[PDB]
Design a protein around this nucleic acid. Structure first.
Ligand SMILES: [Mg+2]
Ligand SMILES: [Mg+2]
Ligand SMILES: [Mn+2]
Ligand SMILES: [Mn+2]
Lengths: 455, 455
DNA sequence: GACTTGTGTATAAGAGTCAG
DNA sequence: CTGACTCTTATACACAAGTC
DNA sequence: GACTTGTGTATAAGAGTCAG
DNA sequence: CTGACTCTTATACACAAGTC
């Protein structure tokens, strides 16, 4: 009702095994305040409390605080929630956290050896429920700093995927069985496939490298090309401006893409490992843009067309992780931090990752009931007042649908492409507004409740 | 009361000679909404009105709209206000407006010929009342695009200073007499001095180039060095982190600087032009940092120590223009714009310059009475509620002083250096907050005024 | 039980940014 | 160009709250 | 007076950003 | 890497409001 950020924070970080209750408690607080003011400074998040501000700073630079522990705590929570769903998607990818202030020096390599920007590489596992594909939470994160000299690396970077699974398993436990891992072409690694199968784990992986199907003695593509057409499907590709490494700008006009779909069993040369596969390829593609084509490898069934489309769907949700990445930087301000020591920075940013998720969830919580499912009478009331005269017939006077647009519109949303879809950032903006105005709504209340003249 | 941004905009742009009342009217509106949401997008400034949004866009890309005219309009206003003061300072400097999106191509050179960032050079005159040094307004702006090939320039860039004066004069008219021009070492131009004197205009200019004093046959410095010590003064130099062109970071610790002061009449070689001068030089400077030293040239009296300190003071206010520059970019979002054509962009940014000023004024309006001088009972009321328990004894319960900190604190302000001074951006943030919450304060009012249950 | 550790409150300053 | 701040880190006191 | 021009409302899309 | 949007610019209708 009155205290979400706070509730949220407790939910997520209540189990932090910090080595002192005080810590865990601070954590929740910090988390809370940060969340409340997603994207803003510790300072601003402190609402003027010096005590808070000092608490927060102290926390992140607290040498007894383990970021791992922090991350683990929030993850645990993910597991917990996961308990409620029968099929889960475990998205997995790597991103970077880049800094160029003094501390960057103490950080890892990201580009060239003389590159001023440095920091961490973080491989994450983001969980979704496979039914409506909503975001459940972070399940894992492996942060690391890349040595300037590759010979200085103890383990190949490529073992992350494997590192991830193991942690997943450990963490999910018996629930692993309901988890499907989704990864981009970079995970096209034999050892990887192999390891998953070994464990009887499920997955969807995009194919990067040509491989042979022992059975047919052909390359996956070629073999799949020969399979019968299960059907196909179509996608709307949206307009956009594009840029290249050289900075050449061009228009990528919208279009409708038609894809052929085929699937089959295959056996890879190496472990002589058998698995299913799917191939979606665009038909009569436009001479300009590049042909859409996905070849995926999975544990999942691919026989009929429904099955194979399920597969396509699953993978299509991989992008959610890219949204998470951006939600953590641009959104939560991961890269906007300027802590002066690697550990302080890491501790801070680790908390920000949970905020990133939340931001994502926020919209989901407004996506397809009556508004008061979600909102409170006063907010609901205010919202209504604020939205006075902007509602469209389409939106039931007072539904959850209404709510979302209303908040979106408070957010600045104007449906420029008329898709009716608002970015998570717009929604966050609207929510923020709503809660800000509410303050005054409730201020007044309190006054006139204690019998006081407004004017 | 209820509509400042709007009032403000009318004040400033009501005379725009746009060639159609509709235009001027749009202008005011646009201005208004932008101001209301200083720093934010047209879109967000549109509060959901499509009509507004479209009005705004249309305006800035309106080929019948003259930016000059826009700028002139707002300036006129400055003149008007200037009427109320006996001594004015006319700050003058050049800045750049830098873009790197497609349009940049159609823009001017700013750095190297292969530099992706391009745009305009803008030389401005910013007026202040010389009594409390508050900001009055923009008096002039000369925008221009620098050719890749210098031989392609019709007029030296250096004639700006002269271009400025002429426009000032024209504009100030008979009031020029009460105007003192303040400029950095770059205006150390003979023709410049000469032109001012020719007109009997007053000024304060920092000396860049060594020159001879005919009378003494010595260099200004040397001659001044020989003058008797009028006294001196001291300045508190604040701590700060510093960076160089190479990116080497260092700490510039705080310190108290002691300056010797001397003044005198001189006559420059060239027009055999006589004028006064002042020399402030730091005594027993710290081996590290560089010695503070200013040699200034003026029309003003410099004989006694009071007179010369007045001079120092005047020049010390030159920095206000640097604040204005930043208020226009970072603040108002000048460089955040992404109009796709030079004129659209210029029209937009021209309006933003007035917003920049306002931002500056905002704090001034809270600087050293009772709060309700400035605020309204409801805001005043809300503010109070919001500030409940943060006020310090120092601040009278309910004064203008109180108001400023209260708003500053809403702004995120925490007095990290305990100077008690809040940036203009913090204050803007607090004001924005206040007005945002007010909305809800007043929402509720309206409800319960029409007899309606809040909850 | 003996020995740290966090809080809230104060005071101070190094580090970083965007403006020169 | 004689800046003007915010964000980050730090320390002390008197007590509170934790750990081993 | 005859001939443009802005508004508000609709529909469409190119341009730009940060994430790959 | 099979994106997901926002900011900017554009056009039409039916009228309103301006200019020469
Ligand atoms: Mg360090
Ligand atoms: Mg162009
Ligand atoms: Mn300057
Ligand atoms: Mn990625």
């Amino acid at each position: 009702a009155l205290h979400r950020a706070a509730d949220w924070a407790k939910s997520v970080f209540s189990s932090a095994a910090l080595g002192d209750p005080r810590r865990t408690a601070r954590l929740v607080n910090v988390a809370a305040q940060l969340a409340k003011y997603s994207g803003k400074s510790i300072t601003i998040s402190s609402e003027g409390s010096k005590a808070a501000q000092e608490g927060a700073y102290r926390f992140i630079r607290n040498p007894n605080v383990s970021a791992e522990a922090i991350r683990k705590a929030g993850a645990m929570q993910t597991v917990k929630l996961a308990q409620e769903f029968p099929e889960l998607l475990a998205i997995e990818d790597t991103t970077s956290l880049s800094y160029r202030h003094q501390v960057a020096e103490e950080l890892g390599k990201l580009g060239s050896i003389q590159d001023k920007s440095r920091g961490w590489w973080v491989h994450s596992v983001l969980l979704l429920e496979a039914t409506t594909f909503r975001t459940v939470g972070l399940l894992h994160q492996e942060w690391w700093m890349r040595p300037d000299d590759p010979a200085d690396a103890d383990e190949k970077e490529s073992g992350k995927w494997l590192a991830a699974a193991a942690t997943s398993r450990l963490r999910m436990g018996s629930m692993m069985s309901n988890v499907i891992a989704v990864c981009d072409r970079e995970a096209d690694i034999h050892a990887y496939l192999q390891d998953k199968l070994a464990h009887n784990e499920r997955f969807v992986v995009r194919s990067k490298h040509p491989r042979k199907d022992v059975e047919s003695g052909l390359y996956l593509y070629d073999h799949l090309k020969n399979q019968p057409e299960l059907g196909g499907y179509q996608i709307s590709i949206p307009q956009k401006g594009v840029v290249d490494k050289r900075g050449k700008r061009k228009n990528r006009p919208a279009r409708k893409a038609s894809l052929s779909l085929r699937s089959g069993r295959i056996t890879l040369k190496q472990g002589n490992i058998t698995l299913n596969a799917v191939l979606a390829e665009e038909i009569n593609p436009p001479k300009g843009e590049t042909p859409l084509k996905w070849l995926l490898l999975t544990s999942e069934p691919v026989e009929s067309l429904a099955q194979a489309l399920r597969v396509i769907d699953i993978y299509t949700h991989r992008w959610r992780i890219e949204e998470f990445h951006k939600a953590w930087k641009t959104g939560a301000g991961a890269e906007r931090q300027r802590m002066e020591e690697p550990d302080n920075l890491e501790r801070m940013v680790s908390i920000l990752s949970f905020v990133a998720v939340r931001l994502l969830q926020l919209r989901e919580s407004f996506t397809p009931q009556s508004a008061e499912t979600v909102l409170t009478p006063d907010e609901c009331q205010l919202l209504g007042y604020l939205d006075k005269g902007k509602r469209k017939r389409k939106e039931k006077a007072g539904s959850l649908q209404w709510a979302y647009m209303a908040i979106a519109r408070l957010g600045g949303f104007m449906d420029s492409k008329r898709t009716g879809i608002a970015s998570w950032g717009a929604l966050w903006e609207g929510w923020e507004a709503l809660q800000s105005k509410l303050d005054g709504f409730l201020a007044a209340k309190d006054l006139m409740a204690q019998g006081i003249k407004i004017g």
